[PDB]
């Protein structure tokens, strides 16, 4: 299973924009990844990770984003935030692993990374695995926005300031969401 | 809550000119700073408004171009910047500041406090 | 930019009398509406607020109402220190001001 394009890509995408990995028709060594020292998350939810390589499913999800340190709590079931309620929402019934790990030395710039975006502004929360990547004018007032950013008219996305300096709250985090369907099986362990 | 503007200056025609408004502590966490002139014996006109909080900024359709408003969250300071100096930029400058929720991020739209204004005379 | 134009310019009334100023926009600006006084040589005083709303310490002779693009401030009873000059304030834009001075 191609689980090394997923955590060793040169790019990942935003909160908003969250890629997703159907993986499928193959043998999936879940060991590469717990007996690796390089994550600072390693939670999964319904599944023990050492009996995951003795176990078979129809397909399993790969999802991948960049938040920030103190907002990987938000990627967890049964949370509110940001993140959950406007980015990436994780059902309550969640069955499957969530790995993270510091990536300062790659999304953060001197003078700021503004490439990484997250959503601000929402009307209605997030269902679990939905994704938006709309870039409506959010209307916080009384007036109509007409496209344009001005007074409690406003952009639904703002940047991460991702600066190396920044403390490791506030630094650039990989994040890789690993779903198992419990739904014919296609994947399964050694 | 105060606000406390810099002392008042004489520029040359197309030189630049940056007004500074300092404000009390966390102001910039609930409130956002804009700024507003006015020549001698003229009415109010409105330039722009920095919201702290977001990093954003906007600025009025005439003063596009020529006014850069930041704010310094280090030392609770606000900056103006007007660009082409001339003889209409003559006048009295005001930092104002406006209530913003820190949650919801809406903007009132009524000034609640206005600073002592700055003098700019724009001669040879 | 919407434009707000305030009628009339110049109103000569005596104290006493009631006064009433003119707001209108060429957009509207639903209720984001203040009222502003300046007397010379100082800086403006809020009025009223979200063009019915009175601010803190303001006499209850000041009263504002409207809603879109026509709006009205209103003195009930002119008092000597209310002669000045009065402005209308959309989000954006100021309006061009009305002089109340003393019928003489």
């Known amino acids: 299973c191609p689980f090394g394009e997923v955590f060793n890509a040169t790019r990942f995408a935003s909160v908003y924009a969250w890629n997703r990995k159907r993986i499928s028709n193959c043998v999936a060594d879940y060991s590469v990844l717990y007996n690796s020292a390089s994550f600072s998350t390693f939670k999964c939810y319904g599944v023990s990770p050492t009996k995951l390589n003795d176990l078979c499913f129809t397909n399993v999800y790969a999802d991948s984003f960049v938040i920030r340190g103190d907002e990987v709590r938000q990627i967890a079931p049964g949370q509110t935030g940001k993140i959950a309620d406007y980015n990436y929402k994780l059902p309550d019934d969640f069955t499957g692993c969530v790995i993270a790990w510091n990536s300062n030395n790659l999304d953060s710039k001197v003078g700021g990374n503004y490439n990484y975006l997250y959503r601000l502004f929402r009307k209605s929360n997030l269902k679990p695995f939905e994704r938006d990547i709309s870039t409506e004018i959010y209307q916080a007032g009384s007036t109509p926005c007409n496209g344009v950013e001005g007074f409690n008219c406003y952009f639904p996305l703002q940047s991460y300031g991702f600066q190396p300096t920044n403390g490791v709250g506030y630094q650039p985090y990989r994040v890789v969401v690993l779903s198992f369907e419990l739904l014919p099986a296609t994947v399964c362990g050694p | 809550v105060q606000l406390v503007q810099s002392g008042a200056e004489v520029k040359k025609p197309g030189s630049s000119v940056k007004v500074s408004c300092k404000a009390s502590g966390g102001t910039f966490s609930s409130y956002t700073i804009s700024w507003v002139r006015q020549a001698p014996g003229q009415g109010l006109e409105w330039m722009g408004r920095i919201i702290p909080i977001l990093d954003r900024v906007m600025y009025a359709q005439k003063f596009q171009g020529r006014v850069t408003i930041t704010a310094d969250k280090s030392t609770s300071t606000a900056y103006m910047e007007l660009s082409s100096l001339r003889s209409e930029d003559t006048a009295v400058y005001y930092c104002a500041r406006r209530a913003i929720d820190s949650d919801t991020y809406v903007e009132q739209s009524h000034f609640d406090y206005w600073g002592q204004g700055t003098l700019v005379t724009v001669s040879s | 930019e919407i434009v707000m134009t305030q009628s009339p310019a110049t109103l000569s009334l005596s104290p006493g009398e009631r006064a009433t100023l003119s707001c209108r926009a060429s957009q509207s600006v639903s209720s984001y509406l203040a009222w502003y006084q300046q007397k010379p040589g100082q800086a403006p005083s809020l009025l009223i607020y979200?063009?019915?709303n009175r601010a803190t310490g303001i006499p209850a002779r000041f009263s504002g109402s409207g809603s879109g693009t026509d709006f009205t401030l209103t003195i009930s009873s002119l008092e000597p220190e209310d002669f000045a000059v009065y402005y209308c304030?959309?989000?954006?834009?100021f309006g061009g001001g009305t002089k109340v001075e003393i019928k003489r």
């Open positions: 979200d063009a019915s």
């Open positions: 304030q959309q989000p954006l834009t």
